[PDB]
Design a protein around this ligand. Structure first.
Ligand SMILES: COc1cc(-c2nc(C)nc3[nH]cc(C#N)c23)c(Cl)cc1Cl
Length: 222
């Protein structure tokens, strides 16, 4: 009897300082947790800047999709908030290198800044704004697709490790999805009014379309 599907999953340890940062963030009380969304939208914008730049000299970079935009997708039934972009995306090595195993100077520097009295909202200036996701999320899943490459899924609940595997669910043309599985007391970020006010307040200068898709699984059809 054959399995419908089978795939290899790799588990990697976070570099020490990244593990420390994630513990501080996911565990500590902060009054301004809404900044996570700003940080994630900012990273999407950067990724969109990148594919756009590459396409300037090689238009075929956009064969996997010309539209450059950001989508925000609250799903109250799954208790997830997903941010999707059609940016450059990442290779498997990119995921492993850039989301856990190699620490930049900004990781330690940021924690030093916080100890010296800085605010968590500054996190983006240290290049680690992604991890601010764990202010509101207990688990984060990153689905990503780069040109000429397969679709991969990265995931961590911040236990000091993350997994990587091939994603065969729903094929993306190109880009990245960051799926936040929200903490039970952070479900306000699934509400339309909350998402809208946070984007209005913090992402006014993002130069790409940002579009809300309110997701609901229709009855008897989950
Ligand atoms: C600079 O540091 C990071 C960047 C990205 C990232 N990279 C690319 C190519 N696209 C993205 N879209 C949304 C993202 C987010 N968040 C994102 C991630 Cl997932 C983690 C880190 Cl630590």
């Amino acid at each position: 009897d054959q399995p419908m599907e089978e795939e290899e999953v790799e588990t990697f340890a976070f570099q020490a300082e990244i593990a420390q940062l994630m513990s501080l963030i996911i565990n500590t009380f902060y009054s301004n947790k809404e900044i996570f969304l700003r940080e994630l939208i900012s990273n999407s914008s950067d990724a969109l800047d990148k594919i756009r730049y590459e396409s300037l000299t090689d238009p075929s970079k956009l064969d996997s999709g010309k539209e450059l935009h950001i989508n925000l997708i609250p799903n109250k039934q799954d208790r997830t908030l997903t941010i999707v972009d059609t940016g450059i995306g990442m290779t498997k090595a990119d995921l492993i290198n850039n989301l856990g195993t190699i620490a930049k100077s900004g990781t330690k520097a940021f924690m030093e800044a916080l100890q010296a009295g800085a605010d968590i909202s500054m996190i983006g200036q240290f290049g680690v704004g992604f991890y601010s996701a764990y202010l509101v999320a207990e688990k984060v899943t990153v689905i990503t697709k780069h040109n000429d490459d397969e679709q991969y899924a990265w995931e961590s609940s911040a236990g000091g490790s993350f997994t990587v595997r091939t994603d065969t669910g729903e094929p993306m043309g190109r880009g990245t999805k960051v799926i936040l599985h929200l903490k039970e007391d952070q479900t306000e970020y699934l509400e339309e009014r909350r998402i809208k006010e946070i984007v209005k307040k913090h992402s006014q200068f993002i130069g790409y379309p940002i579009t809300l898709f309110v997701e609901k699984e229709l009855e008897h059809h989950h």
